[PDB]
Write a protein that binds this ligand. Structure first.
Ligand SMILES: [Cl-]
Ligand SMILES: [Cl-]
Lengths: 181, 181
């Protein structure tokens, strides 16, 4: 069910008249790399993004493999045809019909409700298919924006994982939210 | 630092004068298979063990690969030279220095404190090395014996994962305990 977006035949999940998710493709690496440079300062404070463009290319290629194999998913949020952020399943547990969600949005597109609409469209898409029923978000207790997205979208705080993630020199507590659909 | 146990050169973690952990080796498949047949009735009610001996061989071979690559660990508990149960790291997150522990003990060896001593020896071993610091146990809310082992060993209940695991037709709530060492 691919669909044309330039010479490129993409997998898309509709979101609204102006928003849609497109599966990351190699063609997205240059623009995605630039988006990452622009927001690098705060992305580095989060678990949502691991230097050069070749490094980005590597990351994208690895995720495309996982995406195609159903081990995870990597979608790019496009707003009116312009790349605005990333939304993914960091991991999928097919037997448990469970998935962990990761996400981030370029600073310029923030505050328009884009992430919630994108998130909602992603979960509805996989939940209708009956493929995923348990959606999980794990984020630093101290990442205000990531926690807000979870709280805006019917996720229940299941517990706080003590010093669960190593980032920039320290171990950080991380909240675990879930929603069953 | 292998050590002779029959023609076999095994990796062992000492536990007491009568107990020791030996890394699963293919030579353990026949006896391990028999241990699994004996306890199959209740093992099937738990997340600690996925029919034939070839199936067991497959499972053991896959885990030995993971064990050798540091992605997980699979140790057999030996009590006075006789196979008594299994103790493992279902997964290891090297950057986070975190590991998820799985375990089960043959019915005949239960009630002697063997699992707690084995568990303690495993965590001390990896924690001294500074390799793992966060140990996690995930088990069904309704698995009395697995929960008791966690409560006997300084693990803190971090939260309950709603319908997290698919087993025998249903989704089951599962407790998540952790201990930092
Ligand atoms: Cl985070
Ligand atoms: Cl269990």
């Amino acid at each position: 069910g691919l669909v044309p977006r330039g010479s490129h035949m993409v997998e898309i999940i509709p979101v609204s008249t102006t928003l849609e998710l497109r599966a990351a493709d190699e063609s997205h690496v240059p623009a995605l790399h630039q988006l990452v440079l622009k927001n690098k300062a705060w992305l580095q404070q989060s678990l949502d993004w691991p230097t050069s463009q070749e490094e980005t290319r590597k990351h994208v290629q690895g995720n495309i493999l996982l995406h195609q194999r159903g081990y995870a998913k990597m979608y790019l949020i496009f707003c009116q045809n312009e790349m605005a952020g990333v939304l993914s399943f960091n991991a999928i547990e097919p037997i448990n019909k469970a998935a962990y969600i990761g996400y981030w949005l370029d600073e310029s597109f923030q505050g328009q409700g884009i992430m919630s609409q994108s998130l909602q469209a992603l979960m509805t898409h996989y939940a209708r298919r009956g493929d995923i029923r348990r959606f999980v978000i794990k984020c630093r207790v101290d990442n205000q924006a990531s926690n807000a997205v979870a709280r805006r979208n019917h996720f229940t705080l299941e517990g706080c994982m003590k010093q669960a993630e190593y980032l920039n020199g320290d171990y950080h507590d991380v909240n675990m939210y879930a929603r069953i659909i």
